[PDB]
From a paper:
The protozoan Trypanosoma brucei has a functional pteridine reductase (TbPTR1), an NADPH-dependent short-chain reductase that participates in the salvage of pterins, which are essential for parasite growth. PTR1 displays broad-spectrum activity with pterins and folates, provides a metabolic bypass for inhibition of the trypanosomatid dihydrofolate reductase and therefore compromises the use of antifolates for treatment of trypanosomiasis. PTR1 is a short-chain dehydrogenase/reductase (SDR) able to catalyse the NADPH-dependent two-stage reduction of oxidized pterins to the active tetrahydro-forms. The TbPTR1 subunit forms a single α/β-domain constructed around a seven-stranded parallel β-sheet sandwiched between two sets of α-helices.
Catalytic properties of recombinant TbPTR1 and inhibition by the archetypal antifolate methotrexate have been characterized and the crystal structure of the ternary complex with cofactor NADP+ and the inhibitor determined at 2.2 Å resolution. The asymmetric unit consists of a homotetramer, which represents the functional unit, and overlays of the 251 residues common to each of the four subunits show a root mean square deviation (r.m.s.d.) range in Cα positions of 0.19–0.31 Å (mean 0.25 Å). The functional tetramer displays point group 222, with two active sites, separated by approximately 25 Å, on each side of the assembly. The association between TbPTR1/NADP+ and MTX is primarily through interactions with the pteridine moiety, which is sandwiched between the nicotinamide and Phe97. Four of the six N atoms of the pteridine moiety make direct interactions: N1 with the α-phosphate group of the cofactor and is likely protonated, N2 donates hydrogen bonds to the side-chain hydroxyl and main-chain carbonyl groups of Ser95, N3 accepts a hydrogen bond from the 2′ hydroxyl group of the nicotinamide ribose. The para-aminobenzoic acid (pABA) and γ-Glu components of MTX are directed out of the binding site with the γ-Glu tail of MTX directed towards the N-terminus of the β6-α6 loop. The presence of the larger tryptophan side-chain at this position in TbPTR1 compared with a histidine in LmPTR1, or tyrosine in both TcPTR2 and LtPTR1 in conjunction with the α6 adjustment reduces the size of the pABA binding region in the enzyme derived from the African trypanosome and introduces a significant chemical change in this area of the active site. In TbPTR1 the C-terminal basic residue is His267 but the presence of Trp221 in conjunction with a chemically modified Cys168 (the corresponding residue is Leu184 in LmPTR1) occludes the presence of a solvent network in this part of the active site. The modification of Cys168 by reaction with cacodylate buffer to form dimethylarsinoyl cysteine is intriguing but not unusual in protein chemistry and it is uncertain whether such reactivity has a biological function in T. brucei.
Author numbering:
A (entry chain A): 2 to 104, 113 to 144, 151 to 268
B (entry chain C): 2 to 105, 113 to 268
C (entry chain B): 2 to 104, 112 to 143, 150 to 268
D (entry chain D): 2 to 107, 112 to 144, 151 to 268
């Protein structure tokens, strides 16, 4: 019988590429989304046309709040309701914008969004993932990290704190959930898909920097590393974070 | 004119020892505390005994909440109020307890607020407020020695079982240390960390459990005293570390190097 | 047409498993060996029985010496003479033994030659020679076998540890320098894998216990699995990456 | 009694500033050099004019060879012979030049000479000096080793693989020796410059290119700023510190591509 996966922020871009590749591997998928309702059901439609009743949609804000644990518990619950199991969780959804230290949203909202999406939701989703299993199988969690986590971008401190917290969770959860046969790993893109709204010349500045090919990783290239980690080929791998960055983190100033 | 320093969680233990050594080095200090009012003022009394009006006290919960940015601004303000300047910020205050991922007291969101608030968010807001006050300073046109020192954890990559939120908070602190170091370098504000392995064990910990942790330590088979942690802090704030920023010094007696 | 791979120290254990999985994936293989002649040819015979003319054997000492560069050029040339190409280099051969700092009559300089040569310098020269011969339907890459415990070193293994650290450095330097040629350079870092046969089971179990995921060592095959991912089309953007295959061992404090 | 230190490659630049600061702190010093004889003897003279009988010179090639262990043993011996003790070893001497992985147009040296020089000076010599240092220990004291590492070690410069391998191996040694020598109270630490003193031969525009990369001040570290971290690590304010490598790089290693 088919395994099931939750992918967060799976409506488009890298999240969509992960849901799609997991689907092609034979997973049924919960496509989580926040604001991209149309893209999410459009994705689910295609996947369901491929194989009937193998994709459901689930919407949630993953900003930190007192109700976030409930939302995260529900996200996991939706996978079991639809599919009777939950074998894989991919923590992909992520708020991303600058927060300059020296001077719209209050700083506490930015805290809740940036740290919530990048670290607290992954933590809570991990708790619920594990709780639902215990209290053959190839259970694992993949966290979407950042290969530049130690060469941060200017004025992105909260985002960077969130990705760093995600490294800690990946390692803490790997260690703690190993007795249950739940493996916990990361995939760390460097420059992948640039923002839809980024000007082309700004995109080119980033591409130029990549030693391997002078270009960004495609969403499929990121998804490949994810499906390796969920596979039987990675049965012994846990607490490992795989850079998919084309050498970018190795390039000095 | 003597420089001034803010030290969070400075009433006891490592924070206290940092405050004492900064004061002995010539700093005026803001002693921040949460619950330890008695210890905070008795420290201030002692420092003020040595040099009149060189130690002041400041109370604040550093748990994340919608009033944290305000609280942290006021902490930095208290240093300018008392001493007319703020040269050094030491982020030492820290909540610390287990938070198991699997279950068989506080809600998990209270734990998040406390653990990531004290260890990461408050340091970040204090860093903002510290830097905002140095906005109109050109490091070329001045002879100051501004820095922040973040109290980290040498075991961040070999974490203790069931301490995931604490660990996330310390990881975020490493991220802030590095991000702030880069972003504030144009202001001549250096941002560094000191990472104890096993230092002062909890007062409530059984003596046999204490000795288990002590035995792990290759250099001397003992915990670091609070003074030895403070030595590294004062090096990092000193003129002999003027080119150091984004560095996290381990003070762990080799502990992080020991395999399972 | 079929790609070709060189695997150093390929007669036994992890190296043999890598050579086998590469061959199963469609690679022709050069099976390098040092002292394990019989094992090397029995492996070569087994793979050639599977598919004719897909396996050859190559003897070489990878200790550092004045002749080492020539040996390494010959190992690479060997793959080209046998198969007309060389798509993959796996640096697997490794000397491994204690060298205490404070006090088998091996001199320390022999220990240096053996431990640094096999783990670092031979990898570096094979990399030179590999790159030199390549100086686009191609997928060229190098995989170096590292050590997940490189920053939590075992007691009295300083030269070995220096060897492995130099290999990390080589992986990163070569990844950057060879990227313009489309040559990707990566690492697989076992923690506890195959234990020495002669080691007491009671000592083996001490190591096994340390491992969170399963309380067991990695099989050679599980290590080989990460190797074949790195060389595959599913890793075309991965260079300078070292993947731990350690079942969480490196995350366990003392 | 005054303590004693050995500093390798101490005739000039960073190694000199370390020898000077250790001398100013009250150490007697062995000034090791390879080619810089005049600068070495000139330093010994300045130090001796300040406090008589507190500085000696010792010449040795630290290229890897079958005689390197003897040479390193000699270097350590020279400290016990002059000063009756050896409290501090500073591994500073370092060969530094590109070794491209791909050749095209044919340099000077053979690749095995380059191996012997680059990894001998940066790694093997430090290892043997560490062996001899710990072996010779006699029996209030503060024994330590400081290794000069490199902050850019995981963001290597183009075509410097052998140099980078040496420096990576030196990290390994720092950590391994920290663990292994801890039971004897010998601490082993590192100082990692990013951009400090630029090569004399380097053109001014190239020098300015490196300087402008540094976030903290847009300048290189002086030799004295590097020596400061060294002297902190050998000091009593660092007695619980072992296996730590402190970056002195003005934030350079934190700058993305
Ligand atoms: N793209 C890159 O070059 C790159 C580089 C480094 C690291 N990464 C990591 O790789 C992963 C995917 O990258 P990406 O560029 O594809 O990410 P992205 O497009 O910026 O974001 C992915 C999804 O996250 C969801 N999200 C944002 N805020 C949310 C919130 N408040 N609550 C719930 N969901 C929220 C959004 O869902 P909706 O659209 O439905 O609202 C969004 O589509 C991320 O974790 C990222 O940090 C990517
Ligand atoms: N001790 C060790 O072995 C060790 C190991 C690794 C890292 N560290 C780091 O070194 C630093 C000092 O360690 P330590 O053991 O001295 O710390 P600690 O005793 O556990 O706590 C330090 C102080 O932090 C303050 N604090 C706690 N929760 C707070 C909150 N909600 N709001 C405001 N302040 C709060 C407390 O102040 P009040 O008493 O006034 O309430 C406390 O006295 C910490 O950052 C720690 O993480 C220590
Ligand atoms: N096994 C583990 O638990 C583990 C853990 C961490 C890292 N690793 C790494 O993974 C790789 C494979 O490990 P392993 O246990 O399979 O290795 P191994 O059995 O110790 O050695 C593999 C081969 O290296 C060859 N070799 C040794 N010295 C040589 C020299 N002088 N010149 C040429 N070849 C030489 C030997 O070839 P011959 O038999 O032909 O003489 C040997 O069969 C190694 O690089 C190792 O460091 C393994
Ligand atoms: N920007 C920087 O300068 C920088 C950056 C990162 C790391 N570092 C590290 O910091 C340390 C000091 O840097 P530096 O620039 O002052 O070094 P350097 O001037 O390039 O070299 C220091 C000394 O090493 C000695 N040496 C070279 N080859 C030798 C050999 N074959 N045998 C014995 N001695 C040999 C030379 O001594 P003689 O002159 O007597 O021949 C030289 O004076 C080095 O380890 C370096 O790698 C420096
Ligand atoms: C590598 N990358 C692509 C990119 C796109 N989406 C992402 N989304 C998430 N959640 N996380 C990522 N790290 C991410 N990265 C980058 C890198 C820098 C900037 C950047 O400098 N952003 C500025 C300026 C962008 C602009 O000029 O358009 C900003 O204010 O957002 C954006 C994307
Ligand atoms: C190294 N150390 C000392 C210690 C003391 N106070 C601190 N305080 C803070 N804020 N941060 C630290 N990391 C810290 N560390 C440790 C290490 C382990 C445990 C620990 O396993 N504690 C268990 C129980 C241990 C027990 O008391 O028996 C707990 O539930 O708190 C406590 C302190
Ligand atoms: C994880 N591992 C397995 C192992 C086997 N072969 C290898 N071979 C190589 N080349 N590299 C390795 N890292 C390696 N590792 C280990 C770990 C420790 C000891 C060990 O403590 N050996 C001591 C003790 C031997 C014993 O007690 O039986 C020795 O003196 O060799 C051996 C193998
Ligand atoms: C940071 N730095 C200064 C410098 C000077 N001496 C040293 N000496 C040693 N032993 N180790 C160092 N790391 C070192 N670094 C650098 C950085 C890059 C180049 C460099 O790109 N060198 C090229 C280009 C020289 C040029 O164009 O002038 C070479 O071929 O040597 C030189 C020095
Ligand atoms: Ni981190
Ligand atoms: Ni290394």
């Amino acid at each position: 019988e088919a395994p099931a996966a939750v992918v967060t922020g799976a409506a488009k871009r890298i999240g969509r590429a992960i849901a799609v590749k997991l689907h092609q591997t034979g997973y049924r998928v919960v496509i989580h989304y926040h604001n991209s309702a149309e893209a999410a059901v459009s994705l689910a439609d295609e996947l369901n046309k491929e194989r009937s009743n193998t994709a459901v949609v689930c919407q949630a804000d993953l900003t930190n709040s007192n109700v976030l644990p409930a939302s995260c518990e529900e996200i996991i619950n939706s996978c079991f309701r639809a599919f009777g199991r939950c074998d894989v969780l991919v923590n992909n959804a992520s708020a991303f914008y600058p927060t300059p230290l020296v001077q719209g949203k209050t700083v506490e909202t930015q805290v809740a969004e940036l740290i919530g999406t990048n670290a607290i939701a992954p933590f809570l989703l991990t708790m619920s993932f594990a709780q639902r299993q215990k209290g053959s199988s190839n259970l694992s969690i993949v966290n979407l990290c950042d290969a530049m986590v130690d060469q941060p971008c200017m004025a992105f401190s909260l985002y960077n704190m969130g990705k760093h917290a995600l490294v800690g969770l990946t390692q803490s959860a790997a260690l703690e959930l190993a007795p249950y046969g739940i493996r916990v790993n990361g995939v760390a893109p460097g420059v992948s898909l640039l923002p839809v709204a980024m000007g082309e010349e700004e995109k080119d500045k980033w591409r130029r920097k990549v030693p391997l090919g002078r270009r960004e990783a495609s969403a499929e290239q990121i998804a490949d590393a994810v499906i390796f980690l969920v596979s039987g080929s990675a049965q012994y791998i846990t607490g490992s974070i795989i850079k998919v960055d084309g050498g970018l983190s190795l390039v000095h100033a």
